[PDB]
Scaffold this active site. Structure first.
Site, short mmCIF file in Angstrom:
data_model
loop_
_atom_site.label_atom_id
_atom_site.label_comp_id
_atom_site.label_asym_id
_atom_site.label_seq_id
_atom_site.Cartn_x
_atom_site.Cartn_y
_atom_site.Cartn_z
N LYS A 99 30.90 39.90 43.21
CA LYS A 99 32.35 40.00 43.23
C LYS A 99 32.71 40.72 44.52
O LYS A 99 31.98 41.65 44.91
CB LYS A 99 32.87 40.85 42.05
CG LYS A 99 32.45 40.44 40.62
CD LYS A 99 33.07 39.12 40.16
CE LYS A 99 32.75 38.81 38.70
NZ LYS A 99 33.22 37.43 38.23
N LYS A 111 35.11 37.20 43.76
CA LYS A 111 34.77 35.82 43.32
C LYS A 111 34.55 34.93 44.53
O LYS A 111 33.58 34.16 44.58
CB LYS A 111 35.84 35.25 42.41
CG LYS A 111 35.75 33.72 42.23
CD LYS A 111 36.55 33.24 41.03
CE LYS A 111 35.87 33.68 39.74
NZ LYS A 111 36.60 33.23 38.56
N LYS A 143 23.75 36.24 40.01
CA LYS A 143 24.24 34.86 40.10
C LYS A 143 25.41 34.76 41.09
O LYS A 143 26.11 35.75 41.37
CB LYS A 143 24.63 34.31 38.72
CG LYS A 143 25.80 35.02 38.03
CD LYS A 143 26.04 34.53 36.60
CE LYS A 143 26.65 33.12 36.55
NZ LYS A 143 28.01 33.00 37.23
N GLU A 198 30.85 31.26 39.84
CA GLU A 198 30.91 29.78 39.70
C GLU A 198 31.50 28.92 40.84
O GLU A 198 31.12 27.77 40.98
CB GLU A 198 31.57 29.39 38.37
CG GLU A 198 33.12 29.56 38.27
CD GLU A 198 33.58 30.96 37.86
OE1 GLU A 198 32.79 31.69 37.23
OE2 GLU A 198 34.76 31.30 38.13
N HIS A 200 26.73 26.68 33.49
CA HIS A 200 28.00 27.40 33.51
C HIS A 200 29.07 26.46 32.97
O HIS A 200 29.17 25.30 33.36
CB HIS A 200 28.34 27.91 34.91
CG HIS A 200 29.36 29.02 34.92
ND1 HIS A 200 30.71 28.79 34.85
CD2 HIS A 200 29.21 30.37 34.97
CE1 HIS A 200 31.36 29.95 34.86
NE2 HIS A 200 30.47 30.92 34.94
N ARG A 201 29.88 26.98 32.05
CA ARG A 201 30.82 26.17 31.29
C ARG A 201 32.32 26.36 31.66
O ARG A 201 33.19 26.09 30.84
CB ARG A 201 30.60 26.46 29.81
CG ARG A 201 30.76 27.91 29.46
CD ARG A 201 30.63 28.18 28.00
NE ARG A 201 31.16 29.49 27.67
CZ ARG A 201 31.30 29.96 26.44
NH1 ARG A 201 30.95 29.22 25.40
NH2 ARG A 201 31.82 31.17 26.24
MG MG Z 1 32.04 33.90 37.29
#
Ligand code: MG
Ligand code: CAP
Ligand code: CAP
Ligand code: MG
Ligand code: MG
Lengths: 453, 457, 160
Positions: free
Chosen positions: C26, C28, C51, C54, C147-148
């Site tokens: 972060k 993002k 990670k 997204e 990832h959803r």
């Molecule tokens: Mg995220």
């Protein structure tokens, strides 16, 4: 049970099986195990396990099946000799192009027969391949001619390619590795990776290739002569072999035709050799045989000989294959091994059992390597009879007292001395780098040229 | 020259080199050639030719190079034992994915050293691979569990897969071949190509595959049970292996999870095994070892043992590998070879010299083959201790007196007998196909069950 | 591939190896390659796993290849300093199948001897099964992180 009525026909004539052109012929030195069959029964069983049968009769066998049985045509119990004829129809062929594979030949002629309980040992010494089968093999696409052309030598009888192996075997980081290539190249023509060099964590592949390319350009600019490298691109994964080959050709750019690709073909297998043969037919395929000794050694009574292997390597597509120092170096070898070289270089040659016509198939270069130095070369060429070859000497070059460059020059001079018909100690008065190979290797010097002191 | 002060350190402890994690360990039975150096000098030279050196001092060697020297840490001249420790830094890794290659391990640990003039012979008997290096190997992606699932068996301890090899070895044209598959499948589960079957001119590959697919469909319809086939896709050319594998999966269609791929990995090499492992990770990889005997035989003093080969095959990705009949069949073998099976199936096992933790790597199935029949099976399982495996019997099946189908049933019955632990000969009273295996192989019968003729009639 | 492969790389027991401590990077979006790399270094001094958020990929202010390269450098500076294995999950999501392949291949090759420390993240709800299967079949030995993002449009108990 015994199966010689079906798998033996000693009334066949070798001369007629050859003239008929329908059969591969194999010669083996075999001994039955105490406790089973006599020589013919054991031999007939062997032919069945290597062709159409197993150890019992089966209800599924038909008349067509018998037509393709491998037959035992010649036996000599007192010399342990057994000879078998295999109909060519038995061997596998590619669906994609209709060509032959060496893997099928091996699986039949030297596969499960090597674990039979009723046989103490069997080793293959020679094989014959007729035209209709011979023509379906790749054969070599690149030869020493293409290396002579790049060096500026005549393309016919261009002569001796002076080479080395980068030593230590493993341990040099990219720049030191590159610096040792530069030094040799000041006196010599050709350098190979030692067989395990590749992508070790202390010497990444991409950084090493890049530093060697820089060293080639600096050596060519300093000397005004063309230089060659043989890179190891051996891997389990087919796409890792491609990735490595492609990076090299692209990195070297205008020096891309100075590159040979080395493959550890005995431990990686035919598949690795064919990957490189078919993916890079315009780059010299250097076949390295590390591990071969497990079978080829005369201490082994199983498998096949170095002769057989070499003969196979040519059919597979090797541009050059290591043939050994013929008793002259540090590895097991014999002076009679000169016949191996002539089988791989000529268009007609004699083996221990079979005469072979190559029908114009390209020759394979003998690559002489294994504890050689300037002092051991004269004796070696005397036995073989020519110098149209590549010779690599690692310890002999980097172990020279004055360094890698001088080590390189002593190997050139040693071949000039032989070529001229000169006496080593006397010749060593007009040629210093050769003279200093005497002080580099005084144990060898005292043996070969006793009173040199 | 004597190199023992550089390549020999007998003061190191095996237990610490293991605990330390930074070394592959190899154990060899070695004998020096007469009139050269002694045991330790010969051994030190061996270690140099198998790691960083040669037979002579070179001016290019630096202190970094020494740090990576393979060392001789244990010797026993009386028993011909030599043990060497190889820093894991020495082994080649892929540029494309950072993984390990078996070919590098072989080139160092059993390469140029097999031709040294000052050594009479050396054979590798065991090797240890630590975590940091073990985890860089493929391992198997497909196991017997996936073949149990297809057959409808429990996926844990699913039991004995009854199989055969198609015989004649070569000679059957596509339809007679397909007819012999149909017959076996009426009584058995699994069928493999004999190791050379492929694309011979009298039996083209595409026509054979097509006839076998039809015969699988007709066998499943008639019996109501799932059937399996193992196709040989071995070749020199990588793209010929792919072409063959892709045609099979597409031809079998809804039966394509019934298909295993067989590779003659010994004569074709690791590269052929990896081609099949990486291109088809969801089809069972059947490793066939034709030609292995040249080195593995106890008559050989060079190379490596069947034990070592098998241990390597698992790291490469074999779903199953031929482990032999352990003295009960027609090929060279020993009862003590049961340890080979246990090294390839368990997550922790003992070798002749080292203990190995597999860290959850998938098991490799022992494939028992080589002159087996119904009569020899009880003795075999008694020695091994279990029947969670595939067993193929060619002559044993097709040379049954009543045919391939009855031959198949006799193999099933023989495992049922061992399982419940019945007297083989008494079991035969109430089991027809098994009883007729006595008349099929009367030589074997008289040897194993001496007075059988009386009881059985 | 399963968590057991991630436990093996960390040195944990492959059965009940326990809790993998992780973070997302972060902001993002907004971090340029080095600052992003510096934030990875700092977390790794105390944690196991990181990670991409997204949407992180190849934005014009943080090109993909410079980011991957800076993260690789920070992984091996972190392993050197702490003596423990570190993991990263890279987003390789794209419309084009060959762009997914190109991204995955560059990562594995860049990380080299740390290539078995890499997981691949795929935004499978918005990109679809085809994207998930691309990564499942092209890279079966690399941990497939699903990832959803966007799922809530239907999964929510507000939705009928
Ligand atoms: Mg995220
Ligand atoms: O690995 C080596 O030691 C060599 O580079 C020779 O180095 P040196 O010049 O220092 O001895 C060669 O690979 C061996 O000769 C291979 O044997 P062969 O040719 O019999 O296959
Ligand atoms: O060709 C053969 O002989 C076999 O098909 C067996 O046929 P039978 O069952 O009819 O005898 C097998 O390939 C060998 O047994 C392999 O041996 P191993 O397991 O030792 O590799
Ligand atoms: Mg070498
Ligand atoms: Mg067979």
């Amino acid at each position: 049970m015994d199966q010689s009525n079906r798998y033996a026909n000693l009334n066949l004539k070798e001369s007629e099986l050859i003239a008929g052109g329908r059969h591969v012929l194999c010669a083996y030195i075999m001994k039955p195990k105490a406790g089973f069959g006599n020589f013919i029964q054991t031999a007939a069983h062997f032919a069945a396990e290597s062709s159409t049968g197993t150890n019992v009769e089966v209800s599924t066998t038909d008349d067509f099946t018998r037509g393709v049985d491998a037959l035992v045509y010649e036996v000599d119990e007192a010399n342990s000799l057994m000879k078998i004829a295999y109909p060519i129809e038995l061997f596998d062929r590619n669906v994609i192009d209709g060509r032959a594979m060496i893997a099928s030949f091996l699986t039949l002629t030297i596969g499960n027969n090597q674990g039979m309980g009723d046989v103490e040992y069997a080793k293959m010494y020679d094989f014959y391949v007729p035209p209709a089968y011979l023509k379906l093999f790749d054969g070599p696409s690149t030869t020493i001619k293409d290396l002579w052309r790049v060096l500026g030598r005549p393309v016919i009888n261009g002569g001796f390619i002076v080479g080395t192996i980068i030593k230590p075997k493993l341990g040099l980081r990219p720049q030191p590795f590159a610096n040792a290539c530069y030094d040799f190249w000041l006196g010599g023509d050709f350098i190979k990776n030692d067989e395990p060099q590749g992508n070790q964590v202390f010497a990444p592949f991409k950084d090493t290739v890049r530093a060697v390319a820089d060293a080639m350009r600096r050596a060519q600019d300093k000397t005004g002569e063309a230089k060659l490298f043989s890179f190891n691109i051996t891997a389990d994964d087919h796409y890792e072999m491609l990735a490595r080959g492609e990076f090299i050709l692209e990195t070297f750019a205008d020096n891309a035709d100075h590159i040979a690709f080395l493959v550890d073909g005995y431990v990686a297998g035919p598949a690795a050799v064919t990957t490189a043969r078919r993916a890079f037919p315009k780059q010299y395929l250097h076949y390295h045989r590390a591990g071969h000794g497990a079978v080829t050694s005369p201490q082994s009574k199983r498998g096949y000989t170095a002769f057989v292997l070499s003969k196979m390597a040519r059919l597979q597509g090797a541009s050059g294959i290591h043939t050994g120092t013929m008793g002259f170096g540090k590895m097991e070898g014999e002076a009679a091994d000169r016949a191996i070289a002539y089988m791989i270089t000529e268009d007609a040659a004699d083996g221990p059992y079979f005469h072979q016509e190559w029908l114009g198939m390209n020759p394979t270069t003998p690559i002489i390597s294994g504890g050689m130095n300037a002092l051991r070369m004269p004796g070696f060429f005397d036995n073989l009879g020519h110098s149209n070859l590549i010779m690599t000497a690692g310890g002999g070059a980097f172990g020279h007292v004055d360094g890698g460059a001088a080590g390189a020059k002593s190997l050139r001079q040693a071949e000039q001395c032989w070529k001229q018909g000169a006496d080593p100690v006397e010749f060593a008065k007009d040629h210093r780098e050769f003279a200093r190979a005497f002080e580099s290797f005084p144990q060898d010097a005292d043996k070969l040229y006793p009173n040199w002191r």
